[PDB]
């Protein structure tokens, strides 16, 4: 949080920078429409399909943080927030935790609290660890913190860092990513630096 506090204390990137760091119309599922030049996306109502988007920008160095706004009524069965390399698939023909189900993506299921990386599903670790059966709830907004100096991926909720969910990310070029299953869900991304 010292480097994070310095990042969040700084004036926030403007509309231009938020758009350049927002969702990519040319790197999202065929079932997703990117709106307002990257500030948000809308997933169209397609059955038995999990669909994702990637940010326009890949980070391999420094500290990067972005706010995801995802309404609770628009999450459905599998709402995953995380990162991916440029080769991670952005679509699958069933309802799943797509982001984190392969070697190229890392995600937190914000509905179940499970972490996914090269994961099928059963036995996925809980995040924060030790909270299984506590029926925790991730609010509408959440902060995603990627530290490429340390090679970690973490999350912050209400200005509180939960600690690193994933480690060993150095040498990779990682993009903000999500995977959604909800018909007409709108996910906002608000990049905050560095």
């Amino acid at each position: 949080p010292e480097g994070l506090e310095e990042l969040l204390s700084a004036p926030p990137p403007d509309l231009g920078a938020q758009r350049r760091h927002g969702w990519n119309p040319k790197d999202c599922s065929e079932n997703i429409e990117v709106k307002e030049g990257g500030l948000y996306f809308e997933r169209r109502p397609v059955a038995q399909s999990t669909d994702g988007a990637r940010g326009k920008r890949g980070y391999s160095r420094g500290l990067h943080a972005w706010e995801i706004s995802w309404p609770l009524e628009q999450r459905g069965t599998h709402a995953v927030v995380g990162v991916a390399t440029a080769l991670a698939p952005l679509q699958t023909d069933h309802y799943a935790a797509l982001l984190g189900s392969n070697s190229e993506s890392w995600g937190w299921d914000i509905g179940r609290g499970k972490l996914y990386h090269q994961s099928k599903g059963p036995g996925a670790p809980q995040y924060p660890a030790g909270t299984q059966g506590e029926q925790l709830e991730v609010p509408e907004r959440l902060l995603v913190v990627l530290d490429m100096e340390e090679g970690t991926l973490g999350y912050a909720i209400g200005g509180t860092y939960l600690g690193p969910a994933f480690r060993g990310l150095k040498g990779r070029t990682l993009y903000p990513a999500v995977s959604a299953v909800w018909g007409q869900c709108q996910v906002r991304i608000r990049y905050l630096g560095e």
Binding site: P45, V46, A47, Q48, S49, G76, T77, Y95, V181, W182, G183, Q184, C185
Partner: peptide, 7 residues
């Protein structure tokens, strides 16, 4: 109108 708001 499935579980994930898709009919």
């Amino acid at each position: 109108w499935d579980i994930n708001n898709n009919x």
